[PDB]
Design an enzyme around this catalytic site. Structure first.
Site, short mmCIF file in Angstrom:
data_model
loop_
_atom_site.label_atom_id
_atom_site.label_comp_id
_atom_site.label_asym_id
_atom_site.label_seq_id
_atom_site.Cartn_x
_atom_site.Cartn_y
_atom_site.Cartn_z
N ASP A 34 33.55 -51.82 -9.29
CA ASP A 34 33.67 -51.87 -8.04
C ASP A 34 32.51 -52.28 -7.19
OD1 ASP A 34 34.61 -50.84 -5.38
OD2 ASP A 34 33.99 -48.72 -5.70
N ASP A 214 35.92 -56.49 -1.53
CA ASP A 214 35.96 -55.34 -2.29
C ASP A 214 36.71 -55.54 -3.41
OD1 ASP A 214 35.46 -52.82 -3.44
OD2 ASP A 214 36.06 -51.66 -1.80
#
Lengths: 329, 6
Positions: A34, A214
């Protein structure tokens, strides 16, 4: 090659996974890498929550390097929360290892059904310090300090299911992955990998919008009003109350997102944000776009964006670098 | 979907 390469693997052809291990011995774990969070967490054998039944769990006691702690924590994501306590041990990313601080999650109840429904064990954050709980230095930032890698940057090349796997190169840029010149976009903050760009869809433009590259987001997020204005003249069907926007995959009205700076121009055509939903209906597709309002008008360039664009997140220069990924390796 | 930190 003073830079790694963690082979990533596609998950339900939307997201992707990559491994890492905690504990001084191996103890392998599949993670969601992430760039949108800065906290490595893992399921402990102490986990009591059902979500763990399928997971690989961690045994501190089976690891020589385990440095205890116990400071209870609560990792909050836009999609779920995960509780546990801090602990320290080695972390073996690719082949490089380093004494790292993480979270031994033991309650995965607030991260359902996602967790029980997914194949990953944990979430390994690749973001900026200020985004972390317990103020942990970024793995790649710490690795550089620890002269294990020269450049504190990481590359991402998403695997394209039945085509090729992808790679999380740590410490350098491999031309094998990208086509055309790389263009750098300076960060507007050392939090998420957030750069500033002009958003333009139909003749809807939100200049100087916040853009978060992201990898942990499966969709392309959009400020609600933007979503609502965007889907007005197209023949898109939103099921009442559900973020389910169904289109004919051949809809000639489907817009092409187009973010631009004064350095480069990045676009994501229907081909990259649409999701085939043939089981539901022949010739049908769904947008893979979500309405989501941050405090300041933010767009989230998730997997779909990064899936087209080879990206470079540089801690040293403080910028993300965008280049077109190679269709195949 | 999955939008990953507060």
């Amino acid at each position: 090659s003073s830079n790694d390469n963690i082979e990533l693997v596609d998950f339900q052809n939307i997201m992707f996974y990559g491994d890492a291990e905690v504990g001084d011995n191996q103890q392998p774990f599949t993670f969601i890498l992430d760039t949108g969070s800065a906290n490595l967490w893992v399921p402990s054998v102490k986990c009591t929550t059902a979500g763990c039944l399928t997971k690989h769990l961690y045994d501190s006691s089976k690891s020589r390097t385990y440095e205890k702690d116990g400071t209870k924590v609560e990792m909050n994501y836009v999609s779920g929360t995960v509780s546990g306590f801090f602990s320290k041990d080695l972390v073996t990313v690719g082949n490089l290892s380093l004494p790292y601080k993480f979270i031994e999650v033991i309650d995965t109840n607030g991260f359902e059904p996602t967790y029980t429904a997914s194949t990953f064990d944990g979430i390994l954050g690749l973001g900026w310090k200020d985004l972390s709980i317990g103020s942990v230095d970024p793995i790649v930032v710490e690795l550089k300090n620890q002269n294990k890698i020269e450049n504190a940057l990481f590359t991402f090349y998403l695997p394209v299911h039945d085509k090729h796997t992808g790679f999380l190169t740590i410490g350098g840029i491999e031309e094998r992955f990208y086509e055309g010149p790389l263009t750098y976009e300076k960060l507007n903050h050392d939090l998420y990998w957030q750069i500033t760009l002009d958003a333009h869809v139909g003749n809807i433009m939100l200049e100087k919008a916040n853009c978060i590259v992201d990898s942990g987001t499966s969709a392309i997020t959009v400020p609600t009003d933007f979503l609502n204005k965007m889907l007005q003249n197209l023949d898109v069907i939103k099921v009442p109350f559900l973020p389910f926007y169904v289109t004919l995959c051949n809809n000639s009205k489907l817009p092409t997102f187009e973010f631009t700076s004064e350095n480069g121009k990045y676009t994501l055509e229907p081909e990259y944000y649409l999701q085939h939903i043939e089981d539901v209906g022949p010739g049908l597709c769904m947008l893979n776009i979500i309405g989501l309002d941050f405090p300041v008008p933010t767009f989230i360039l998730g997997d779909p964006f990064m899936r087209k664009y080879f990206t470079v997140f540089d801690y040293d220069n403080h910028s993300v670098g965008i280049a077109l990924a190679k269709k195949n390796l | 979907x999955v939008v990953x930190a507060x």
